[PDB]
Amino acid sequence: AQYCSVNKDIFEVEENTNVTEPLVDIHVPEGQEVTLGALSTPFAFRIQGNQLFLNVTPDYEEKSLLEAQLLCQSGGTLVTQLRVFVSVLDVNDNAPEFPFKTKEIRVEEDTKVNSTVIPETQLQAEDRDKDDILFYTLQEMTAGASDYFSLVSVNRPALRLDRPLDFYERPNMTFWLLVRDTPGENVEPSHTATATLVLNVVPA
Ligand SMILES: [Ca+2]
Ligand SMILES: [Ca+2]
Ligand SMILES: [Ca+2]
């Protein structure tokens, strides 16, 4: 019983969790001392009273894996070394953001029905939760607008022309574009962003 040990060396910690309590007791044989080695993730861990602590609140978007190198020395010479891993778990802690608030697109009256008029690249939002699937909804602001345009799908926000345009009858169509980072509208956590789309019909 003359080797350093830990009973647990893989920890899962949700990002934004403050862990003040020890992760683990380090069993140190009489005559040895344990310190953090230089392969340890910088500014993450400390050892006090032969216990390993997290000093910081993890952020999955900054770093998803934290490593502690435990060096077990006797008179300053290395006897053994242990690794401890903290696997950081992603939380939905970022809101999707559109790169615009209100935006206008001009569309020729004779645009072919079923044409893409705004590609996904011009409408898509970005969410710093890289794994979040974004769900897009189009809501008419001016009555009848949804008769003319729709999104290709809730996850592919390309705007498609669905019916022939008529400059005289309806030269302006305005929409609310909503994005959320959850499939469900009423779940928690869920973040929503909104933008306005103005479709201006140009005549022949
Ligand atoms: Ca984060
Ligand atoms: Ca996150
Ligand atoms: Ca998110």
Side-chain angles (χ1 to χ4, degrees), residues 161-199:
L161 180 68
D162 298 319
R163 284 172 68 87
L165 300 172
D166 184 332
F167 170 76
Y168 298 97
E169 181 173 344
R170 196 170 275 100
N172 172 292
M173 278 139 303
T174 302
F175 295 100
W176 281 294
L177 183 61
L178 311 181
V179 63
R180 63 170 186 275
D181 56 6
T182 63
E185 294 183 13
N186 314 134
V187 302
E188 285 149 347
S190 182
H191 309 103
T192 297
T194 75
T196 291
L197 294 177
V198 176
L199 282 288

PDB file of all heavy atoms in Angstrom, residues 161-199:
ATOM      1  N   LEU A 161     -40.999  31.205 -53.075  1.00  0.00           N
ATOM      2  CA  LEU A 161     -42.231  31.788 -53.658  1.00  0.00           C
ATOM      3  C   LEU A 161     -43.218  30.644 -53.963  1.00  0.00           C
ATOM      4  O   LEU A 161     -42.848  29.691 -54.685  1.00  0.00           O
ATOM      5  CB  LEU A 161     -41.893  32.589 -54.917  1.00  0.00           C
ATOM      6  CG  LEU A 161     -43.079  33.233 -55.610  1.00  0.00           C
ATOM      7  CD1 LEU A 161     -43.690  34.347 -54.768  1.00  0.00           C
ATOM      8  CD2 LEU A 161     -42.670  33.774 -56.969  1.00  0.00           C
ATOM      9  N   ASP A 162     -44.432  30.743 -53.445  1.00  0.00           N
ATOM     10  CA  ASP A 162     -45.462  29.678 -53.565  1.00  0.00           C
ATOM     11  C   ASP A 162     -46.583  30.029 -54.526  1.00  0.00           C
ATOM     12  O   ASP A 162     -47.278  29.103 -54.940  1.00  0.00           O
ATOM     13  CB  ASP A 162     -46.075  29.413 -52.209  1.00  0.00           C
ATOM     14  CG  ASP A 162     -45.035  28.907 -51.241  1.00  0.00           C
ATOM     15  OD1 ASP A 162     -44.197  28.062 -51.676  1.00  0.00           O
ATOM     16  OD2 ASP A 162     -45.069  29.361 -50.084  1.00  0.00           O
ATOM     17  N   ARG A 163     -46.797  31.305 -54.836  1.00  0.00           N
ATOM     18  CA  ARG A 163     -47.897  31.724 -55.746  1.00  0.00           C
ATOM     19  C   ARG A 163     -47.438  32.925 -56.548  1.00  0.00           C
ATOM     20  O   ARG A 163     -46.619  33.713 -56.072  1.00  0.00           O
ATOM     21  CB  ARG A 163     -49.169  32.068 -54.966  1.00  0.00           C
ATOM     22  CG  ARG A 163     -49.923  30.843 -54.477  1.00  0.00           C
ATOM     23  CD  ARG A 163     -51.050  31.229 -53.548  1.00  0.00           C
ATOM     24  NE  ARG A 163     -52.104  31.948 -54.239  1.00  0.00           N
ATOM     25  CZ  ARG A 163     -53.137  31.386 -54.878  1.00  0.00           C
ATOM     26  NH1 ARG A 163     -53.271  30.062 -54.936  1.00  0.00           N
ATOM     27  NH2 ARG A 163     -54.038  32.166 -55.465  1.00  0.00           N
ATOM     28  N   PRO A 164     -47.961  33.109 -57.773  1.00  0.00           N
ATOM     29  CA  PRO A 164     -47.544  34.245 -58.595  1.00  0.00           C
ATOM     30  C   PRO A 164     -47.728  35.573 -57.850  1.00  0.00           C
ATOM     31  O   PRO A 164     -48.733  35.756 -57.207  1.00  0.00           O
ATOM     32  CB  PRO A 164     -48.427  34.166 -59.857  1.00  0.00           C
ATOM     33  CG  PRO A 164     -48.987  32.769 -59.872  1.00  0.00           C
ATOM     34  CD  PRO A 164     -48.947  32.242 -58.448  1.00  0.00           C
ATOM     35  N   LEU A 165     -46.729  36.447 -57.929  1.00  0.00           N
ATOM     36  CA  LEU A 165     -46.764  37.794 -57.338  1.00  0.00           C
ATOM     37  C   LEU A 165     -47.609  38.691 -58.242  1.00  0.00           C
ATOM     38  O   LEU A 165     -47.756  38.391 -59.475  1.00  0.00           O
ATOM     39  CB  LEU A 165     -45.342  38.338 -57.186  1.00  0.00           C
ATOM     40  CG  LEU A 165     -44.430  37.501 -56.292  1.00  0.00           C
ATOM     41  CD1 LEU A 165     -42.998  38.012 -56.352  1.00  0.00           C
ATOM     42  CD2 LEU A 165     -44.944  37.505 -54.859  1.00  0.00           C
ATOM     43  N   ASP A 166     -48.137  39.741 -57.653  1.00  0.00           N
ATOM     44  CA  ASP A 166     -48.939  40.759 -58.368  1.00  0.00           C
ATOM     45  C   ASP A 166     -48.622  42.106 -57.722  1.00  0.00           C
ATOM     46  O   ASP A 166     -49.115  42.367 -56.643  1.00  0.00           O
ATOM     47  CB  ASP A 166     -50.413  40.355 -58.315  1.00  0.00           C
ATOM     48  CG  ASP A 166     -51.337  41.271 -59.090  1.00  0.00           C
ATOM     49  OD1 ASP A 166     -50.996  42.465 -59.226  1.00  0.00           O
ATOM     50  OD2 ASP A 166     -52.404  40.768 -59.540  1.00  0.00           O
ATOM     51  N   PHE A 167     -47.827  42.920 -58.397  1.00  0.00           N
ATOM     52  CA  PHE A 167     -47.345  44.237 -57.935  1.00  0.00           C
ATOM     53  C   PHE A 167     -48.516  45.152 -57.544  1.00  0.00           C
ATOM     54  O   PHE A 167     -48.391  45.864 -56.541  1.00  0.00           O
ATOM     55  CB  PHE A 167     -46.503  44.881 -59.030  1.00  0.00           C
ATOM     56  CG  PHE A 167     -46.155  46.310 -58.771  1.00  0.00           C
ATOM     57  CD1 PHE A 167     -45.162  46.627 -57.858  1.00  0.00           C
ATOM     58  CD2 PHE A 167     -46.811  47.336 -59.440  1.00  0.00           C
ATOM     59  CE1 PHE A 167     -44.836  47.948 -57.613  1.00  0.00           C
ATOM     60  CE2 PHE A 167     -46.475  48.655 -59.189  1.00  0.00           C
ATOM     61  CZ  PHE A 167     -45.493  48.960 -58.275  1.00  0.00           C
ATOM     62  N   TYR A 168     -49.610  45.136 -58.311  1.00  0.00           N
ATOM     63  CA  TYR A 168     -50.760  46.048 -58.119  1.00  0.00           C
ATOM     64  C   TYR A 168     -51.514  45.641 -56.856  1.00  0.00           C
ATOM     65  O   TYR A 168     -51.851  46.534 -56.020  1.00  0.00           O
ATOM     66  CB  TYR A 168     -51.605  46.094 -59.402  1.00  0.00           C
ATOM     67  CG  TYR A 168     -50.774  46.632 -60.529  1.00  0.00           C
ATOM     68  CD1 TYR A 168     -50.147  45.782 -61.424  1.00  0.00           C
ATOM     69  CD2 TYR A 168     -50.545  47.990 -60.643  1.00  0.00           C
ATOM     70  CE1 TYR A 168     -49.346  46.275 -62.443  1.00  0.00           C
ATOM     71  CE2 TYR A 168     -49.742  48.499 -61.644  1.00  0.00           C
ATOM     72  CZ  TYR A 168     -49.142  47.638 -62.545  1.00  0.00           C
ATOM     73  OH  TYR A 168     -48.367  48.149 -63.521  1.00  0.00           O
ATOM     74  N   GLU A 169     -51.770  44.349 -56.717  1.00  0.00           N
ATOM     75  CA  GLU A 169     -52.602  43.806 -55.629  1.00  0.00           C
ATOM     76  C   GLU A 169     -51.809  43.854 -54.322  1.00  0.00           C
ATOM     77  O   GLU A 169     -52.365  44.312 -53.305  1.00  0.00           O
ATOM     78  CB  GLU A 169     -53.042  42.407 -56.033  1.00  0.00           C
ATOM     79  CG  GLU A 169     -53.927  41.750 -55.018  1.00  0.00           C
ATOM     80  CD  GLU A 169     -54.504  40.430 -55.473  1.00  0.00           C
ATOM     81  OE1 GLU A 169     -54.471  40.169 -56.673  1.00  0.00           O
ATOM     82  OE2 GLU A 169     -55.005  39.683 -54.610  1.00  0.00           O
ATOM     83  N   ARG A 170     -50.548  43.423 -54.337  1.00  0.00           N
ATOM     84  CA  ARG A 170     -49.761  43.312 -53.077  1.00  0.00           C
ATOM     85  C   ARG A 170     -48.280  43.555 -53.364  1.00  0.00           C
ATOM     86  O   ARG A 170     -47.523  42.614 -53.582  1.00  0.00           O
ATOM     87  CB  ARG A 170     -50.070  41.960 -52.435  1.00  0.00           C
ATOM     88  CG  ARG A 170     -49.635  41.883 -50.983  1.00  0.00           C
ATOM     89  CD  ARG A 170     -50.159  40.647 -50.304  1.00  0.00           C
ATOM     90  NE  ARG A 170     -51.508  40.846 -49.798  1.00  0.00           N
ATOM     91  CZ  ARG A 170     -52.643  40.434 -50.372  1.00  0.00           C
ATOM     92  NH1 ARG A 170     -52.648  39.768 -51.521  1.00  0.00           N
ATOM     93  NH2 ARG A 170     -53.792  40.702 -49.775  1.00  0.00           N
ATOM     94  N   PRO A 171     -47.836  44.826 -53.401  1.00  0.00           N
ATOM     95  CA  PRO A 171     -46.437  45.143 -53.674  1.00  0.00           C
ATOM     96  C   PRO A 171     -45.510  44.969 -52.467  1.00  0.00           C
ATOM     97  O   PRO A 171     -44.327  44.926 -52.694  1.00  0.00           O
ATOM     98  CB  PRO A 171     -46.472  46.622 -54.043  1.00  0.00           C
ATOM     99  CG  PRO A 171     -47.628  47.152 -53.206  1.00  0.00           C
ATOM    100  CD  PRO A 171     -48.648  46.037 -53.197  1.00  0.00           C
ATOM    101  N   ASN A 172     -46.071  44.923 -51.252  1.00  0.00           N
ATOM    102  CA  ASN A 172     -45.304  44.798 -49.974  1.00  0.00           C
ATOM    103  C   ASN A 172     -45.872  43.636 -49.167  1.00  0.00           C
ATOM    104  O   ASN A 172     -47.116  43.571 -49.006  1.00  0.00           O
ATOM    105  CB  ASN A 172     -45.319  46.072 -49.116  1.00  0.00           C
ATOM    106  CG  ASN A 172     -44.696  45.889 -47.738  1.00  0.00           C
ATOM    107  OD1 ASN A 172     -45.235  45.181 -46.877  1.00  0.00           O
ATOM    108  ND2 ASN A 172     -43.564  46.535 -47.507  1.00  0.00           N
ATOM    109  N   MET A 173     -44.992  42.754 -48.683  1.00  0.00           N
ATOM    110  CA  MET A 173     -45.338  41.625 -47.780  1.00  0.00           C
ATOM    111  C   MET A 173     -44.310  41.652 -46.647  1.00  0.00           C
ATOM    112  O   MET A 173     -43.103  41.603 -46.948  1.00  0.00           O
ATOM    113  CB  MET A 173     -45.299  40.271 -48.491  1.00  0.00           C
ATOM    114  CG  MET A 173     -46.576  39.970 -49.263  1.00  0.00           C
ATOM    115  SD  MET A 173     -46.355  39.214 -50.879  1.00  0.00           S
ATOM    116  CE  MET A 173     -45.300  40.424 -51.662  1.00  0.00           C
ATOM    117  N   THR A 174     -44.760  41.745 -45.399  1.00  0.00           N
ATOM    118  CA  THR A 174     -43.847  41.757 -44.234  1.00  0.00           C
ATOM    119  C   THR A 174     -44.118  40.537 -43.363  1.00  0.00           C
ATOM    120  O   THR A 174     -45.298  40.163 -43.170  1.00  0.00           O
ATOM    121  CB  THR A 174     -43.913  43.084 -43.482  1.00  0.00           C
ATOM    122  OG1 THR A 174     -43.568  44.090 -44.432  1.00  0.00           O
ATOM    123  CG2 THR A 174     -42.952  43.143 -42.319  1.00  0.00           C
ATOM    124  N   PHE A 175     -43.034  39.955 -42.856  1.00  0.00           N
ATOM    125  CA  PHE A 175     -43.036  38.751 -42.004  1.00  0.00           C
ATOM    126  C   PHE A 175     -42.203  38.982 -40.755  1.00  0.00           C
ATOM    127  O   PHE A 175     -41.219  39.729 -40.819  1.00  0.00           O
ATOM    128  CB  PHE A 175     -42.408  37.570 -42.731  1.00  0.00           C
ATOM    129  CG  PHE A 175     -43.167  37.110 -43.941  1.00  0.00           C
ATOM    130  CD1 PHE A 175     -42.766  37.489 -45.207  1.00  0.00           C
ATOM    131  CD2 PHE A 175     -44.263  36.285 -43.806  1.00  0.00           C
ATOM    132  CE1 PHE A 175     -43.470  37.061 -46.326  1.00  0.00           C
ATOM    133  CE2 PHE A 175     -44.956  35.840 -44.927  1.00  0.00           C
ATOM    134  CZ  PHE A 175     -44.566  36.234 -46.182  1.00  0.00           C
ATOM    135  N   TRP A 176     -42.627  38.351 -39.673  1.00  0.00           N
ATOM    136  CA  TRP A 176     -41.783  38.066 -38.493  1.00  0.00           C
ATOM    137  C   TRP A 176     -41.095  36.732 -38.776  1.00  0.00           C
ATOM    138  O   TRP A 176     -41.805  35.756 -39.141  1.00  0.00           O
ATOM    139  CB  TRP A 176     -42.587  37.979 -37.203  1.00  0.00           C
ATOM    140  CG  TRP A 176     -42.966  39.297 -36.614  1.00  0.00           C
ATOM    141  CD1 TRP A 176     -42.123  40.236 -36.092  1.00  0.00           C
ATOM    142  CD2 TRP A 176     -44.303  39.807 -36.451  1.00  0.00           C
ATOM    143  NE1 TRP A 176     -42.843  41.307 -35.630  1.00  0.00           N
ATOM    144  CE2 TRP A 176     -44.184  41.073 -35.834  1.00  0.00           C
ATOM    145  CE3 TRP A 176     -45.583  39.325 -36.773  1.00  0.00           C
ATOM    146  CZ2 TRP A 176     -45.304  41.860 -35.534  1.00  0.00           C
ATOM    147  CZ3 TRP A 176     -46.686  40.103 -36.479  1.00  0.00           C
ATOM    148  CH2 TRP A 176     -46.548  41.356 -35.867  1.00  0.00           C
ATOM    149  N   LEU A 177     -39.786  36.709 -38.651  1.00  0.00           N
ATOM    150  CA  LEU A 177     -38.981  35.476 -38.686  1.00  0.00           C
ATOM    151  C   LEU A 177     -38.553  35.186 -37.252  1.00  0.00           C
ATOM    152  O   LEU A 177     -37.873  36.041 -36.668  1.00  0.00           O
ATOM    153  CB  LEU A 177     -37.782  35.677 -39.608  1.00  0.00           C
ATOM    154  CG  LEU A 177     -36.900  34.446 -39.796  1.00  0.00           C
ATOM    155  CD1 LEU A 177     -37.658  33.282 -40.413  1.00  0.00           C
ATOM    156  CD2 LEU A 177     -35.707  34.811 -40.632  1.00  0.00           C
ATOM    157  N   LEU A 178     -38.967  34.044 -36.713  1.00  0.00           N
ATOM    158  CA  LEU A 178     -38.604  33.603 -35.345  1.00  0.00           C
ATOM    159  C   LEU A 178     -37.612  32.468 -35.458  1.00  0.00           C
ATOM    160  O   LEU A 178     -37.743  31.646 -36.376  1.00  0.00           O
ATOM    161  CB  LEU A 178     -39.832  33.103 -34.586  1.00  0.00           C
ATOM    162  CG  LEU A 178     -41.056  34.007 -34.621  1.00  0.00           C
ATOM    163  CD1 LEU A 178     -42.180  33.386 -33.806  1.00  0.00           C
ATOM    164  CD2 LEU A 178     -40.722  35.389 -34.106  1.00  0.00           C
ATOM    165  N   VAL A 179     -36.674  32.396 -34.527  1.00  0.00           N
ATOM    166  CA  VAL A 179     -35.806  31.203 -34.432  1.00  0.00           C
ATOM    167  C   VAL A 179     -35.784  30.805 -32.963  1.00  0.00           C
ATOM    168  O   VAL A 179     -35.765  31.719 -32.116  1.00  0.00           O
ATOM    169  CB  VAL A 179     -34.398  31.456 -35.006  1.00  0.00           C
ATOM    170  CG1 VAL A 179     -33.631  32.536 -34.238  1.00  0.00           C
ATOM    171  CG2 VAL A 179     -33.607  30.166 -35.081  1.00  0.00           C
ATOM    172  N   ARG A 180     -35.810  29.508 -32.683  1.00  0.00           N
ATOM    173  CA  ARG A 180     -35.611  28.981 -31.310  1.00  0.00           C
ATOM    174  C   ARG A 180     -34.576  27.866 -31.405  1.00  0.00           C
ATOM    175  O   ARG A 180     -34.398  27.303 -32.522  1.00  0.00           O
ATOM    176  CB  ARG A 180     -36.939  28.554 -30.666  1.00  0.00           C
ATOM    177  CG  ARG A 180     -37.645  27.421 -31.381  1.00  0.00           C
ATOM    178  CD  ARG A 180     -38.840  26.811 -30.658  1.00  0.00           C
ATOM    179  NE  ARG A 180     -39.301  25.659 -31.434  1.00  0.00           N
ATOM    180  CZ  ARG A 180     -40.152  25.695 -32.468  1.00  0.00           C
ATOM    181  NH1 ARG A 180     -40.697  26.828 -32.890  1.00  0.00           N
ATOM    182  NH2 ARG A 180     -40.473  24.571 -33.083  1.00  0.00           N
ATOM    183  N   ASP A 181     -33.929  27.544 -30.279  1.00  0.00           N
ATOM    184  CA  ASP A 181     -32.840  26.531 -30.230  1.00  0.00           C
ATOM    185  C   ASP A 181     -33.355  25.210 -29.637  1.00  0.00           C
ATOM    186  O   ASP A 181     -32.528  24.412 -29.230  1.00  0.00           O
ATOM    187  CB  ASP A 181     -31.638  27.087 -29.476  1.00  0.00           C
ATOM    188  CG  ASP A 181     -31.919  27.574 -28.064  1.00  0.00           C
ATOM    189  OD1 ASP A 181     -33.069  27.397 -27.561  1.00  0.00           O
ATOM    190  OD2 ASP A 181     -30.980  28.156 -27.492  1.00  0.00           O
ATOM    191  N   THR A 182     -34.674  25.005 -29.585  1.00  0.00           N
ATOM    192  CA  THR A 182     -35.318  23.760 -29.100  1.00  0.00           C
ATOM    193  C   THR A 182     -36.443  23.370 -30.049  1.00  0.00           C
ATOM    194  O   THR A 182     -37.101  24.229 -30.630  1.00  0.00           O
ATOM    195  CB  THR A 182     -35.843  23.924 -27.669  1.00  0.00           C
ATOM    196  OG1 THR A 182     -36.864  24.933 -27.650  1.00  0.00           O
ATOM    197  CG2 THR A 182     -34.724  24.244 -26.702  1.00  0.00           C
ATOM    198  N   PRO A 183     -36.719  22.068 -30.239  1.00  0.00           N
ATOM    199  CA  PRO A 183     -37.845  21.659 -31.069  1.00  0.00           C
ATOM    200  C   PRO A 183     -39.181  22.142 -30.482  1.00  0.00           C
ATOM    201  O   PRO A 183     -40.044  22.498 -31.243  1.00  0.00           O
ATOM    202  CB  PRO A 183     -37.819  20.124 -31.055  1.00  0.00           C
ATOM    203  CG  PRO A 183     -36.505  19.736 -30.443  1.00  0.00           C
ATOM    204  CD  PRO A 183     -35.966  20.929 -29.692  1.00  0.00           C
ATOM    205  N   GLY A 184     -39.290  22.128 -29.148  1.00  0.00           N
ATOM    206  CA  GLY A 184     -40.497  22.503 -28.389  1.00  0.00           C
ATOM    207  C   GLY A 184     -40.551  24.002 -28.148  1.00  0.00           C
ATOM    208  O   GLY A 184     -39.489  24.607 -27.859  1.00  0.00           O
ATOM    209  N   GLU A 185     -41.740  24.585 -28.263  1.00  0.00           N
ATOM    210  CA  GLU A 185     -41.950  26.045 -28.083  1.00  0.00           C
ATOM    211  C   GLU A 185     -42.003  26.416 -26.596  1.00  0.00           C
ATOM    212  O   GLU A 185     -41.640  27.555 -26.275  1.00  0.00           O
ATOM    213  CB  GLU A 185     -43.249  26.480 -28.757  1.00  0.00           C
ATOM    214  CG  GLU A 185     -43.221  26.338 -30.262  1.00  0.00           C
ATOM    215  CD  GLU A 185     -44.487  26.828 -30.937  1.00  0.00           C
ATOM    216  OE1 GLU A 185     -45.290  27.507 -30.250  1.00  0.00           O
ATOM    217  OE2 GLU A 185     -44.676  26.533 -32.142  1.00  0.00           O
ATOM    218  N   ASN A 186     -42.437  25.498 -25.729  1.00  0.00           N
ATOM    219  CA  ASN A 186     -42.809  25.805 -24.319  1.00  0.00           C
ATOM    220  C   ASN A 186     -41.885  25.104 -23.322  1.00  0.00           C
ATOM    221  O   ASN A 186     -42.260  25.044 -22.141  1.00  0.00           O
ATOM    222  CB  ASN A 186     -44.268  25.425 -24.047  1.00  0.00           C
ATOM    223  CG  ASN A 186     -45.208  25.902 -25.137  1.00  0.00           C
ATOM    224  OD1 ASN A 186     -46.063  25.155 -25.591  1.00  0.00           O
ATOM    225  ND2 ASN A 186     -45.055  27.136 -25.573  1.00  0.00           N
ATOM    226  N   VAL A 187     -40.724  24.606 -23.752  1.00  0.00           N
ATOM    227  CA  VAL A 187     -39.763  23.903 -22.843  1.00  0.00           C
ATOM    228  C   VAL A 187     -38.764  24.924 -22.277  1.00  0.00           C
ATOM    229  O   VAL A 187     -38.689  26.047 -22.817  1.00  0.00           O
ATOM    230  CB  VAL A 187     -39.056  22.734 -23.550  1.00  0.00           C
ATOM    231  CG1 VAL A 187     -40.072  21.721 -24.076  1.00  0.00           C
ATOM    232  CG2 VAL A 187     -38.120  23.210 -24.662  1.00  0.00           C
ATOM    233  N   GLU A 188     -38.028  24.515 -21.238  1.00  0.00           N
ATOM    234  CA  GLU A 188     -37.020  25.317 -20.491  1.00  0.00           C
ATOM    235  C   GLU A 188     -35.760  24.470 -20.274  1.00  0.00           C
ATOM    236  O   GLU A 188     -35.862  23.353 -19.784  1.00  0.00           O
ATOM    237  CB  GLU A 188     -37.666  25.787 -19.183  1.00  0.00           C
ATOM    238  CG  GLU A 188     -38.659  26.926 -19.403  1.00  0.00           C
ATOM    239  CD  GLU A 188     -39.856  27.024 -18.467  1.00  0.00           C
ATOM    240  OE1 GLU A 188     -40.135  26.052 -17.725  1.00  0.00           O
ATOM    241  OE2 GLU A 188     -40.519  28.083 -18.492  1.00  0.00           O
ATOM    242  N   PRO A 189     -34.533  24.925 -20.632  1.00  0.00           N
ATOM    243  CA  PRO A 189     -34.289  26.236 -21.245  1.00  0.00           C
ATOM    244  C   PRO A 189     -34.580  26.255 -22.759  1.00  0.00           C
ATOM    245  O   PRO A 189     -34.364  25.247 -23.429  1.00  0.00           O
ATOM    246  CB  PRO A 189     -32.788  26.433 -21.001  1.00  0.00           C
ATOM    247  CG  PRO A 189     -32.232  25.033 -21.121  1.00  0.00           C
ATOM    248  CD  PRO A 189     -33.290  24.153 -20.494  1.00  0.00           C
ATOM    249  N   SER A 190     -35.071  27.385 -23.262  1.00  0.00           N
ATOM    250  CA  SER A 190     -35.307  27.649 -24.705  1.00  0.00           C
ATOM    251  C   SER A 190     -35.104  29.143 -24.970  1.00  0.00           C
ATOM    252  O   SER A 190     -35.600  29.941 -24.195  1.00  0.00           O
ATOM    253  CB  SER A 190     -36.667  27.203 -25.140  1.00  0.00           C
ATOM    254  OG  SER A 190     -36.849  27.437 -26.532  1.00  0.00           O
ATOM    255  N   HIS A 191     -34.403  29.495 -26.032  1.00  0.00           N
ATOM    256  CA  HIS A 191     -34.111  30.905 -26.367  1.00  0.00           C
ATOM    257  C   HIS A 191     -34.678  31.199 -27.743  1.00  0.00           C
ATOM    258  O   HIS A 191     -34.531  30.337 -28.619  1.00  0.00           O
ATOM    259  CB  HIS A 191     -32.619  31.172 -26.334  1.00  0.00           C
ATOM    260  CG  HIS A 191     -31.970  30.708 -25.079  1.00  0.00           C
ATOM    261  ND1 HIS A 191     -31.241  29.549 -25.045  1.00  0.00           N
ATOM    262  CD2 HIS A 191     -31.959  31.228 -23.824  1.00  0.00           C
ATOM    263  CE1 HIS A 191     -30.780  29.370 -23.815  1.00  0.00           C
ATOM    264  NE2 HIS A 191     -31.214  30.391 -23.043  1.00  0.00           N
ATOM    265  N   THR A 192     -35.261  32.381 -27.902  1.00  0.00           N
ATOM    266  CA  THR A 192     -35.911  32.818 -29.158  1.00  0.00           C
ATOM    267  C   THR A 192     -35.276  34.140 -29.572  1.00  0.00           C
ATOM    268  O   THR A 192     -34.973  34.954 -28.682  1.00  0.00           O
ATOM    269  CB  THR A 192     -37.432  32.929 -28.999  1.00  0.00           C
ATOM    270  OG1 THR A 192     -37.933  31.627 -28.699  1.00  0.00           O
ATOM    271  CG2 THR A 192     -38.138  33.410 -30.250  1.00  0.00           C
ATOM    272  N   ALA A 193     -35.081  34.320 -30.876  1.00  0.00           N
ATOM    273  CA  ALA A 193     -34.693  35.585 -31.516  1.00  0.00           C
ATOM    274  C   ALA A 193     -35.729  35.863 -32.611  1.00  0.00           C
ATOM    275  O   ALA A 193     -36.360  34.895 -33.125  1.00  0.00           O
ATOM    276  CB  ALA A 193     -33.296  35.494 -32.052  1.00  0.00           C
ATOM    277  N   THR A 194     -35.935  37.141 -32.913  1.00  0.00           N
ATOM    278  CA  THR A 194     -36.954  37.605 -33.875  1.00  0.00           C
ATOM    279  C   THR A 194     -36.281  38.611 -34.802  1.00  0.00           C
ATOM    280  O   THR A 194     -35.341  39.292 -34.370  1.00  0.00           O
ATOM    281  CB  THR A 194     -38.188  38.193 -33.173  1.00  0.00           C
ATOM    282  OG1 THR A 194     -37.848  39.481 -32.687  1.00  0.00           O
ATOM    283  CG2 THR A 194     -38.699  37.371 -32.020  1.00  0.00           C
ATOM    284  N   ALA A 195     -36.721  38.644 -36.044  1.00  0.00           N
ATOM    285  CA  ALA A 195     -36.282  39.622 -37.055  1.00  0.00           C
ATOM    286  C   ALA A 195     -37.474  39.872 -37.976  1.00  0.00           C
ATOM    287  O   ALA A 195     -38.418  39.060 -37.945  1.00  0.00           O
ATOM    288  CB  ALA A 195     -35.080  39.113 -37.785  1.00  0.00           C
ATOM    289  N   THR A 196     -37.448  40.975 -38.717  1.00  0.00           N
ATOM    290  CA  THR A 196     -38.509  41.358 -39.683  1.00  0.00           C
ATOM    291  C   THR A 196     -37.940  41.162 -41.099  1.00  0.00           C
ATOM    292  O   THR A 196     -36.747  41.484 -41.333  1.00  0.00           O
ATOM    293  CB  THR A 196     -39.055  42.759 -39.356  1.00  0.00           C
ATOM    294  OG1 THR A 196     -39.788  42.718 -38.123  1.00  0.00           O
ATOM    295  CG2 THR A 196     -39.993  43.290 -40.413  1.00  0.00           C
ATOM    296  N   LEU A 197     -38.745  40.594 -42.002  1.00  0.00           N
ATOM    297  CA  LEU A 197     -38.415  40.439 -43.433  1.00  0.00           C
ATOM    298  C   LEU A 197     -39.436  41.250 -44.207  1.00  0.00           C
ATOM    299  O   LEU A 197     -40.633  41.055 -43.977  1.00  0.00           O
ATOM    300  CB  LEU A 197     -38.509  38.983 -43.892  1.00  0.00           C
ATOM    301  CG  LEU A 197     -37.508  38.013 -43.286  1.00  0.00           C
ATOM    302  CD1 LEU A 197     -37.793  36.618 -43.808  1.00  0.00           C
ATOM    303  CD2 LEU A 197     -36.093  38.441 -43.617  1.00  0.00           C
ATOM    304  N   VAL A 198     -38.963  42.102 -45.089  1.00  0.00           N
ATOM    305  CA  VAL A 198     -39.825  42.928 -45.971  1.00  0.00           C
ATOM    306  C   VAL A 198     -39.559  42.457 -47.400  1.00  0.00           C
ATOM    307  O   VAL A 198     -38.403  42.589 -47.863  1.00  0.00           O
ATOM    308  CB  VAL A 198     -39.539  44.418 -45.767  1.00  0.00           C
ATOM    309  CG1 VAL A 198     -40.334  45.260 -46.734  1.00  0.00           C
ATOM    310  CG2 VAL A 198     -39.814  44.844 -44.329  1.00  0.00           C
ATOM    311  N   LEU A 199     -40.582  41.925 -48.062  1.00  0.00           N
ATOM    312  CA  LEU A 199     -40.532  41.501 -49.478  1.00  0.00           C
ATOM    313  C   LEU A 199     -41.220  42.601 -50.291  1.00  0.00           C
ATOM    314  O   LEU A 199     -42.456  42.823 -50.056  1.00  0.00           O
ATOM    315  CB  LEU A 199     -41.242  40.156 -49.628  1.00  0.00           C
ATOM    316  CG  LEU A 199     -40.456  38.911 -49.189  1.00  0.00           C
ATOM    317  CD1 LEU A 199     -39.349  38.606 -50.158  1.00  0.00           C
ATOM    318  CD2 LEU A 199     -39.880  39.042 -47.796  1.00  0.00           C
TER     319      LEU A 199
END
